[PDB]
């Protein structure tokens, strides 16, 4: 529930990811879009990133409105 705890968990997943499917498959990520993709942290915030052979790079937060 807690946004901090969710963020920590999304970050964990980003660091653990090995293929884009690791971030696209979990439906709790609601992954949207070599282009930049993003995962839902909650209703307001998303983690943007570029997928690379070496994992996630240029990670940022975005509040689309």
């Amino acid at each position: 529930s807690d946004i901090k705890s969710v963020a920590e968990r999304k970050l964990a997943m980003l660091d653990a990811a090995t293929e884009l499917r690791d971030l696209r498959s979990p439906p709790g990520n609601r992954l949207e879009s070599a282009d930049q993709h993003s995962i839902r942290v909650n209703d307001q915030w998303r983690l943007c990133f570029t997928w690379t052979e070496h994992g996630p790079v240029n990670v940022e937060i975005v509040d689309y409105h």
């Binding site: 920590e8 968990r9 964990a12 660091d15 990811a17 090995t18 293929e19 498959s25 979990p26 439906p27």
Partner: protein, 95 residues
Amino acid sequence: GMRPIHPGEILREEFQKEMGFSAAALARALGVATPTVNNILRERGGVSADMALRLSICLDTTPEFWLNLQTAFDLRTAEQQHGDEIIGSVQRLVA
């Protein structure tokens, strides 16, 4: 490294909560006994290389994804519980 994040937390919160399966349903898909999935969901036990493969095929992930979370969790845990104890004990053999 912040708090340790058990792979069971990812399983429960990022798959089970949104999809809705019961522990037993996942156990049936993976081909394992239901308590083995509980153990993980309740964060009572780790994920084996074998369980990692089953999860990866079942849930469209890589097996390393699950072992990496297990790695980071075992390691954050050890550093919290025994870190200050170990860094004061071990003799350095390599410059």
